[PDB]
Amino acid sequence: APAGSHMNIKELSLHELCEELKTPAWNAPLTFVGDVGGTSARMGFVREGKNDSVHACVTRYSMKRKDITEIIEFFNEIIELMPASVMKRVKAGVINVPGPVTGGAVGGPFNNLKGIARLSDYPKALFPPGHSAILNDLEAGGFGVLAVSDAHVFSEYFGVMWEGTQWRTCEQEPAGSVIGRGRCLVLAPGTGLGSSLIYYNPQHIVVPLELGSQTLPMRKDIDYIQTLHAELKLFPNYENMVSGAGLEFHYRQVVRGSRPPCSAGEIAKLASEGDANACKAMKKYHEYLMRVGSEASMALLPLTIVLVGDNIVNNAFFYRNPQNLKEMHHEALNHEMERFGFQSRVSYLRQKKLLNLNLMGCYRCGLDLS
Amino acid sequence: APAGSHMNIKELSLHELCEELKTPAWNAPLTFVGDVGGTSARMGFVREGKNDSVHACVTRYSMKRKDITEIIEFFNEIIELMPASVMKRVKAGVINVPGPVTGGAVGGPFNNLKGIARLSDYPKALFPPGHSAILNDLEAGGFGVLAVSDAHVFSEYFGVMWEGTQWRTCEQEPAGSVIGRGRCLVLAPGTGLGSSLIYYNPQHIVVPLELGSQTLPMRKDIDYIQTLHAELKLFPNYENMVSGAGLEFHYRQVVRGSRPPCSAGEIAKLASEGDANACKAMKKYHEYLMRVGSEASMALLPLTIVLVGDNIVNNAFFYRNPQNLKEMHHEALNHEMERFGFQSRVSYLRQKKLLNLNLMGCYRCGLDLS
Ligand SMILES: Nc1ncnc2c1ncn2[C@@H]1O[C@H](COP(=O)(O)OP(=O)(O)O)[C@@H](O)[C@H]1O
Ligand SMILES: Nc1ncnc2c1ncn2[C@@H]1O[C@H](COP(=O)(O)OP(=O)(O)O)[C@@H](O)[C@H]1O
Ligand SMILES: OC[C@H]1O[C@@H](O)[C@H](O)[C@@H](O)[C@@H]1O
Ligand SMILES: OC[C@H]1O[C@@H](O)[C@H](O)[C@@H](O)[C@@H]1O
């Protein structure tokens, strides 16, 4: 019932997408959107239905050549098919990319993609000047988190891990029910570690960050961090510990050549099945994710930290174990500033139902942009 | 003759302050302002003159009990002694405090002051309801940096240390002549380490930060950091290395008993006279300030970093020495992410002319609240 709460995202073949857009229901203003990641991209169009409902259909391309410029071919092969009837309806064009974006127009460099995303190189049919942008992925995600809060459906998609000291101080509503009137640190651990701060005051503004790339501070783990360092030939950062390659590293350190190396996916799958080794590796992954959160808790003074992404949803098992959850909490407050209770001010929440926040975010940004 | 470019800040005894406010020039809407430090507070009133000129009149109080609640007594004294005709011109009331502030109404805890700053406990005579705010010190400082920029006199108060790679890419104007359309990170190295991020985008918002309280990551200084740690019985943060107490530590470590201990002030004075030990101490302090800078250049993606405060202007001798500057620049770039050029994107600037940024920010903000 609540306005904006119906959010449908359907993935189709390019042909099916094209046929879908010819149906009478899609004779409306179109926003082109693209959630471009390291390995795949979902590109498509979004319209607003009845009851402020959000209707999206996208096609997934593979980022095989690992080159952010590749997507220009995608845009072009899309413009190749679609009828003029459809193309005239495009009112805005917004994409997100997995790297730092400046001026909303130049993205990169990327850790795992070649090149630089350039809005000025994109086809104006999909990217109308004055109504177009490149967002960073977690910037897109933050607009998405905002959109979900505005559609009154926050507790449908996010679960409370633990409510911090400060929420009671400034919120009339229950935690997890709305984004809240306070800063929101949005974290997404996957291939990389994304972070964005939704800042609030006289009201919500999404500010892109790169916390993952900060040098990782040693606590009582000089040896662990020096092992990774000799492997990477670099001073480890947070992402090195909290990413796919991170989880794989933790797993290797646990088994010590007693079992074959597994991918991030395999390790998590093993953990969901109660494998001791994989569970140990997941705890370490999560120990360092709580270190990201403890320091950002100090540095950014957020009201809430919200963990997002398919990996979070899919890892629900890890978070629902009350023992895992107690130890993460303990880790989240393991900072010298906690003596003043800064780490305990913060409420942690985790995405609990699947939803492409990034596309919701491009669409929303696309509204603002026209 | 540029608009807003006259900024006079007169510090007077309270009686002179009272007399001043009686003069025809001060019959005008007033903002009560207060720049409340850990050792003293300048509190008074600001008005706008011809050509958007800014005229502030403040009095100094010593923070004698080291208690933030003590300022309420100062507020009351000020009301007691002020003419009632003056009190009715008060449109807004804004102070800043050396600590994090939530909801613009509750401030602290503080490093060297007891208690908590409560807007609700302040007299409405000086803080009119709905027109009043407690700012963090660098929050205020950030607004003051904006004030200077809008007044077209950025180049009068700030000097370019080095222009980053990104400036010429998005800025027609010379580095140092404008704030710039891009994030500005303000750092105020004093008794503590202040930080605030001036974010930009359709326009400028000031986001308070607590970067100094983050755990200091070890590079090749495990032993140095462990030495500090054993003295503090805390894992060191940035502010432990880059503060008054940090500078004193750096000096003690240089001299190794061969010389009596000196205060931060004594050490910078010795440095200005060319003492070798104090210059070494000052080099180490600025090495850690550069680590603050290289990590936050990554994390916050600023276009510019701006070192502010009396200390900074007063230490100009340190920044003008070309070997020191070159050393600082190399240090600002000593990060693993510089292989992607992130640290070299950033332009560094330092305040080169004395100016109470905090009071200017309290005023700028009090314009928003009235
Ligand atoms: N259950 C899991 N938990 C943690 N990490 C995972 C899991 N499954 C996969 N990963 C890692 O995360 C990556 C996918 O994360 P995702 O956010 O979906 O996409 P990307 O980060 O590539 O845009 C995988 O390539 C793998 O390295
Ligand atoms: N030239 C200097 N360089 C660095 N630090 C200094 C210098 N002179 C004094 N200090 C230290 O800085 C602090 C005062 O700085 P300031 O920012 O003006 O005030 P506060 O931070 O106490 O509000 C004191 O702790 C003092 O010991
Ligand atoms: O994809 C998540 C994150 O991975 C990081 O390595 C990139 O630098 C970020 O910009 C991105 O948000
Ligand atoms: O006074 C400068 C800084 O000192 C720090 O220790 C405080 O926590 C900050 O809020 C403040 O900006």
Looking at the DSSP bridge assignments, the partners of residue A44 are A33, A58
Residues A238, A241, A242, A248, Cα dihedral to 10°: 160
Is the alpha carbon torsion for A266, A271, A275, A279 positive or negative? Answer: positive
User: Nearest Cβ partner of A213 from B219, B337, B368?
Assistant: B337
Structure-token match 């306070």, residue found: A182
Burial of A360 (0-12, 13-18, 19+ CB in 10 A): buried
The method of structure determination was X-ray
Asked if residue B191 belongs to a known ligand binding site, the reply is yes
Sign of the dihedral through C-alpha A318, A324, A325, A331: negative
Beta pairing partners, B48: B54
Regarding whether A137 and A110 lie in a shared domain, the answer is: yes
> What's the total number of domains in chain A?
2
The values of phi and psi at residue A98, to 5°, are -80, 50
Rounded to 5 degrees, what angle do the CA atoms A341, A207, B177 make? 110
Q: Give the closest of B100, B216, B341 to A217, CB-based.
A: B216
Listed residue (A107, A84, A97, A86) closest to A21, CA to CA: A86
Kindly report the CATH number assigned to the domain that includes residue B233: 3.40.367.20
Secondary structure of residue A165 in the 3-state scheme? coil
Do B195 and B186 touch, CB atoms closer than 8 A?
Answer: yes
Q: Which ligand is nearest to the CA of B140?
A: 4
DSSP A54-117: EEEEEEEEE-TT-BGGGHHHHHHHHHHHS-HHHHTTEEEEEEEESS-EETTTEE---SSSBS-E
Distances (CA, A) of B369 to A278, B21, B89, B93, B103: 55, 22, 14, 9, 14
Residues whose CB falls within 8 Å of the CB of residue A119, separated by 6 or more in sequence, listed in order: A104, A105, A106, A127, A132, A133, A134
A97: left (phi over 0), alpha (psi -120 to 50) or beta: beta
- For a mutational test of ligand 2's pocket, the pick from B40, B112, B187, B191, i.e. the residue with the most ligand atoms closer than 8 A to its C-beta, is B191
Contact yes or no for B56/B30 (Cβ under 8 A) = no
| CATH number assigned to the domain comprising residue B136 | 3.30.420.40
Instruction: Give which of A86, A186, A92 is closest to A133, Cα–Cα.
Output: A92
Residue among B101, B210, B237 whose CB has most ligand 4 atoms within 8 A, to mutate: B210
Identify the three-state secondary structure at position B30: strand
Q: Is the CB of B99 under 6 A from ligand 4?
A: yes
Resolution of this entry in Å? 2.1
On whether both A236 and A127 belong to a single domain, the answer is no
| Whether residue A138 sits in one domain with residue A57 | yes
Residues B326 and A234: their CA atoms lie apart, in Å, by: 24
Task: Using the atom order of ligand 3, give the atom closest to the CA of residue A137.
Answer: 12
Pairing of strands B54-62, B40-48: antiparallel
- Among candidates A337, A334, A317, A335, which has minimal Cα distance to A325? A317
A97 - beta bridge partners? A136
Chain B residue with CA closest to A105: the answer is B170
| Residue B139 CA, ligand 4 centroid: distance in Å | 10
Q: From the CB of residue B341, how many other CB atoms can be counted at a distance below 10 Å?
A: 13
Alpha carbon of A310 to ligand 1 centroid (Å):
8
User: B243 and B348 in one domain?
Assistant: yes
Strand order in the sheet with B40-48: B7-11, B54-62, B40-48, B30-36, B90-97, B132-136
CB B20 within 8 Å of CB B82: no
Q: What is the DSSP string of A286-344?
A: HHHHHHHHHHHHHHH--SEEEE-SHHHHHTHHHHHSHHHHHHHHHHHT-SGGGGGTSGG
Give Cα B365 distance to the centre of its chain.
16
Chain B residue closest in CA terms to A335:
B215
Q: Is A36 in the pocket of ligand 3 (CB under 6 A)?
A: no
Of the candidates B206, B201, B46, the residue with the CA atom closest to the CA atom of residue B139? B206
Q: Is B315 annotated as a binding residue?
A: yes
Q: Which residues of B touch A342 (CB under 8 A)?
A: 100, 210, 213
Query: Residue A214: its chain B contacts at CB < 8 A?
Result: 217, 295, 298-299
* Placement of tokens 């025809």 in the chain: B24
**Would you call B80 helix, strand, or coil by DSSP?**
helix
Q: Is A182 found in the same domain as A64?
A: no
Position A295: which residue type?
A: E
Regarding whether A201 and A137 lie in a shared domain, the answer is: no
How many CB pairs lie under 8 A apart between chains A and B? 97
Residue B175 vs residues A138, A321, A328, B181, B306: alpha-carbon distances, Å: 30, 54, 45, 12, 12
The radius of gyration of chain B from alpha carbons, rounded to an integer in Å, stands at: 21
Ligand having the closest approach to the CA of B194: 4
Cβ contact A217:B219 at 8 Å: no
Same domain, A76 and A182: no
CA separation for the pair A282, A292 (Å, rounded): 15
| Inter-axis angle of helices A276-300 and A244-255, nearest 10 | 130
B44 burial type by CB count under 10 A (0-12 exposed, 13-18 middle, 19+ buried): buried
What is the Cα–Cα distance from B138 to B103, expressed in whole angstroms? 16
Helix (H, G, I), strand (E, B) or coil at A147: helix
How would you classify the pairing of strands B193-200 and B204-208? antiparallel
Question: Which stretches does DSSP call E strand in B64-171?
Answer: 90-97, 101-102, 106-107, 117-118, 132-136, 158-162
* Cβ neighbours of A215 in B, within 8 Å: 217, 219, 295, 335-336
Name chain B contacts of A300, Cβ cutoff 8 Å: 209-210
DSSP string, A27-48: -S-EEEEEEE-SSEEEEEEEEE
Tokens representing A140 are 């897109």
H or E, element range at B62: strand B54-62
Name the minimum distance, in Å, from the CA of B218 to any CA of chain A: 6
Query: Residue B149 and residue B143: Cα distance in Å, rounded?
Result: 10
B82, B188: one domain: no
* Closest ligand 2 atom to Cα of B271: 1
Strand partners, B94: B33, B133
DSSP B277: H
How far separated are the first and last CA of chain B, in Å rounded? Answer: 26
Do B361 and B331 lie in a common domain?
no
Tokens 């050509």 label which residue?
Answer: B51
**Phi, psi (rounded to 5 degrees) for A243:** -175, 175
Q: Are residues A232 and A369 in the same domain?
A: no
Q: Is the CB of B35 under 6 A from ligand 4?
A: no
> Which member of B199, B217, B218 has the closest CB to residue A207?
B199
Cα dihedral across residues B250, B252, B258, B264: positive or negative: positive
Residue A160 CA from chain centroid, whole number: 18
Nearest-angstrom CA–CA distance, A325 and A163: 13
Task: Answer whether the bond into residue B109 is a cis peptide, omega within 30°.
Answer: yes
For residue B84, what are the domain limits? 1-152+356-370
Tell me: do B92 and B192 sit in the same domain.
no
Tell me which residue of B159, B191, B148 sits closest to B316, measured CA to CA. Answer: B159
Residue A213: C-alpha distances to residues A45, A118, A133, A186, B335 (Å): 32, 22, 24, 15, 10
Contact B210 A298 (CB under 8 A): yes
Q: Please tell me which of the candidates A202, A205, A217 has its beta carbon nearest to residue B215.
A: A217
Check whether residue B292 and residue B182 sit in a common domain. Answer: yes
SS3 at position A169: helix
Relative to the CA of B192, which ligand 4 atom is closest?
4
C-alpha A247/C-alpha A278 separation (Å) is: 9
What spatial distance separates the first Cα and last Cα of chain A, rounded to whole Å?
Answer: 26
Nearest bound ligand to CA B39?
2
Q: Quick one: CA dihedral B255, B261, B263, B265, positive or negative?
A: negative
The helix (H) or strand (E) run that includes residue B34 is: strand B30-36
Residue nearest to atom 8 of ligand 2 (CA): B265
